[PDB]
């Protein structure tokens, strides 16, 4: 009756089912479409699927462990980002608000009538997260080894320098999975990784 777990029907379903694709009404006017919450939504089929992911895909569970965490560290920052407002902040937190923003508009963002976002194949789904987590860990490894030595950097020297890298990392959701070939999409995500391994070596 308005999005609660107090009524006897919603609370006595979550004691029975294993997947909860928890949707809210506050997170609907963003034109996000779905209204995914990803804080109260769970899935208890992660232990049963540790054999399918490790055999057929063999890489995905540590990226899924990290990608659920980056969207969680953003939440416990965002109450202070509203009230205090980005003034005296660490620079490892500015990664997990800009890389975390890149997930929330280019990975968990959909629109269902479009010729690229009515089907999302899973090899392209792990192909998009294979680059986004690599950009997060390379932004973290840059900011922690260049924290004391000489010419300490922030994020705001990278996003101005690497603005063309953040276009290819934002134009993965707009590649059509239907017209393009099956292997036409992984090579584009494997050629982009060397435009993400060489690009950081242009700053250091």
């Amino acid at each position: 009756p308005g999005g609660d777990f107090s009524d006897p029907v919603t609370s006595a379903t979550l004691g029975i089912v294993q997947v909860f694709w928890g949707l809210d009404k506050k997170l609907a006017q963003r034109k996000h479409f779905p209204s995914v919450n990803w804080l109260i939504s769970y899935s208890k089929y992660m232990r049963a699927l540790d054999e399918y992911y490790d055999k057929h895909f063999t890489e995905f569970v540590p990226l899924r462990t990290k990608a659920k965490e980056i969207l969680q560290e953003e939440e416990d920052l965002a109450e202070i980002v509203q009230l205090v407002g980005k003034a005296s902040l660490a620079e490892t937190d500015k990664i997990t608000l800009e890389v975390a923003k890149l997930i929330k508009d280019d990975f968990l963002q959909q629109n269902g009538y479009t010729p690229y976002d009515r089907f999302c194949p899973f090899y392209k789904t792990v192909g998009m997260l294979s680059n986004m987590i690599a950009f997060y860990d390379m932004a973290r490894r840059a900011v922690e080894t260049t924290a004391q030595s000489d010419n300490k950097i922030t994020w705001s020297i990278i996003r101005e320098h690497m603005g063309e890298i953040l276009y290819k990392l934002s134009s993965m959701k707009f590649k059509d999975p239907v017209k393009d070939g099956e292997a036409k999409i992984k090579a584009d995500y494997a050629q982009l990784l060397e435009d993400m391994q060489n690009a950081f070596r242009s700053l250091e």
Binding site: P1, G2, D4, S6, D7, E79, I80, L83, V84, G85, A87, S88
Partner: protein, 213 residues
């Protein structure tokens, strides 16, 4: 003013338990954001009286040079008030925040003009530069005192607003959400009690139907 308008139900109990809990998290920010601003507010008072005692020194040691131009050059005050066009020290403003509120702080600047490079060319100009060094490192101090009393009155106004906003939750908002909670747990005890009797009364009417048979 005494209750937030809602009617007692099971769902409306969890929403006024969440809004109370969603207010206690706001006060927990503002209870310590004021003290974090008060943590910087004591240190400016732990700087302003210490800087004021250096002000009593520099205006003596440079004031012990005021004779060291006047025992030598006599009176030269008609030079400094009739021969001046452009000063040397400039002031540029700089913002430098603490904890969500900004603080405008004064910064030194070095213009490159002086209308006093040929002063003392007749009798002596070496004793003037002894005073001139002694007064310039007063302005190299008094730009820090003038920046310290201007970050005082920015943290003096931002603390006296946050408090009126921790107290506006402690004494206005959160007691109103608590008193409507103590009315939902009361009026729903009443709706269970009137349905205690009604579920009991239909049971005796089933017993009247069974002793007939």
């Amino acid at each position: 003013k005494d209750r937030i308008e809602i009617f007692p139900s099971r769902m409306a109990q969890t929403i006024m338990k969440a809004r109370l809990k969603g207010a206690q998290t706001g006060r927990n920010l503002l209870k310590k954001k004021s003290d974090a601003l008060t943590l910087r507010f004591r240190q400016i008072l732990k700087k302003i009286i210490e800087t004021k005692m250096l002000m009593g020194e520099v205006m003596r040691e440079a004031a012990f040079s005021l004779a060291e131009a006047k025992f030598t050059a006599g009176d030269f005050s008609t030079t400094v008030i009739q021969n001046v066009n452009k000063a040397q020290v400039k002031i540029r403003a700089k913002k430098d925040n603490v904890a969500g509120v900004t603080l405008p702080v004064f910064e030194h600047y070095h213009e490159g003009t002086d209308s006093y490079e040929l002063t003392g060319l007749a009798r002596g100009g070496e004793q003037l530069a002894k005073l001139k060094r002694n007064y310039a490192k007063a302005v190299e101090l008094l730009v820090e005192l003038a920046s310290l009393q201007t970050s005082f009155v920015t943290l003096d106004e931002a603390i006296k607003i946050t408090n009126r906003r921790v107290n506006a939750i402690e004494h206005v908002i959160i007691p109103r959400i608590e008193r409507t909670l103590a009315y939902i747990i009361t009026e729903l005890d009443e709706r269970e009690r009137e349905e205690f009797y009604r579920l009991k009364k239909i049971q005796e009417k089933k017993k009247i139907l069974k002793e007939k048979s």
